[PDB]
Amino acid sequence: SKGEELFTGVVPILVELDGDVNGHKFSVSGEGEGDATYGKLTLKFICTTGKLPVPWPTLVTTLVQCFSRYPDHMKQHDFFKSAMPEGYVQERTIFFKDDGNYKTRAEVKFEGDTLVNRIELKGIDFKEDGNILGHKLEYNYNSHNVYIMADKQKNGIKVNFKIRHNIEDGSVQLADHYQQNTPIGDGPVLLPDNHYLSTQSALSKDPNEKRDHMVLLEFVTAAGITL
């Protein structure tokens, strides 16, 4: 009922990812702030185990949609905040066209005053000389439309979208995202009418960071339901 009240101001964020892609294990930690009133994320991630064995852009979607801007006329359609503070489970399969897939399971919840995203990621069937394991993706990111619908079981939501990764040679690598979210708690949640989010992201580097890392600025707004 009142989960949205936890997001009226700036909220600290922690992200922890445990990854294994084709047997290459790695860990990523992230921290920063989200300002859901304005759909804004300011985050920095580091690969704490060493070199990241996949391109950073391929992890962006895995690495907190409760910080999406939901405008006032769409407040009754914001599943993500309604599940808080107990949180939700977010599961994906991500199919990289003509390459392997990621499967992920995350818990997104408050731990004290911090919104924490804790993820396990498994990647299989990647080509050692493909675009992912061969690091042929540009260090940049596109704008996407994210499609949201209530699930048929009346428990949570399904989410579908296609991510476009620019390849160094000028082509585009599609990453087809299949997503499901369910509440962790027994409390009531908001099941939305169908709608979409529109995303903007910028990836950068911190000149004083010596570890493999990603600085991320992200702006996300919901839309599609009016008056």
């Binding site: 009133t37 304005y38 920095k44 296609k162 702006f219 339901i225 009016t226």
Partner: protein, 298 residues
Amino acid sequence: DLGKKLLEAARAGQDDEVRILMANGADVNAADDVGVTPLHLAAQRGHLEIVEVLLKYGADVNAADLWGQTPLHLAATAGHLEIVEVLLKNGADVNARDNIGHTPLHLAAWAGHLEIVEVLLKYGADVNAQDKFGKTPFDLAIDNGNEDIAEVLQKAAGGGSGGGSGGGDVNAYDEVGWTPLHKAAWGHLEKVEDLLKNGADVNAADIDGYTPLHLAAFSGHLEIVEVLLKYGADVNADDQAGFTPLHLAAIFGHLEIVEVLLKNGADVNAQDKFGKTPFDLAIDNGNEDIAEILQKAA
């Protein structure tokens, strides 16, 4: 050590402690490990006395954090009007860019802060600035439902009144290939009709392959489905989409939409990216009446 305390005092609004720390030699341009300075924090959190004293003591008004944000970006987003004005009077770059290429005017338009939009224009904000995804502040205001701001921004660009309801090249498209008609498909029937009457392309596909008819079927708007079809929409559009409008209608249980699609020649044998026909999807989603209709039409 003094730098950290000054960052905290600025953040918490302790103007008495700010004055003390400065008298003890604190570096007014101290920065944390993500480039945030005391001026950033005071500007973002609305602490005007502290913004003023920091600027008096030489704080860098255009300091950028790791995300490219200046204090003016943060104050324009947070909605602190007098802080915006004070920053501009002390040399803030009115067209500074964050890492997505947003100027302060983009952010105020996005955030719905009309008075700040107007002050930024007064101090030289570029009304035609585009961020890295091609959006002007007008575009961000429109797409966020901030119609009053959109009306102001179109006027400031010399485009006359009426911007609140959209600035009208009926076949403009953004970087994801959305035309005005893609946006109107989400339940704006009168706008769909107006756009088509003024020459909008009914079959424009977005970057994912979706036509307005896909979006109208996904969002369940029967009367919009009907008028798109009346204006020649391809009932079986797929190509890059990987599914047709009838697949979508079969998923979400709108029997009347299925019926008009079939009436207009929708293909019951089309397969989506998983090899499913609309009948298969109707079964999978528990939409039994739709499944029976689709089987009759097999």
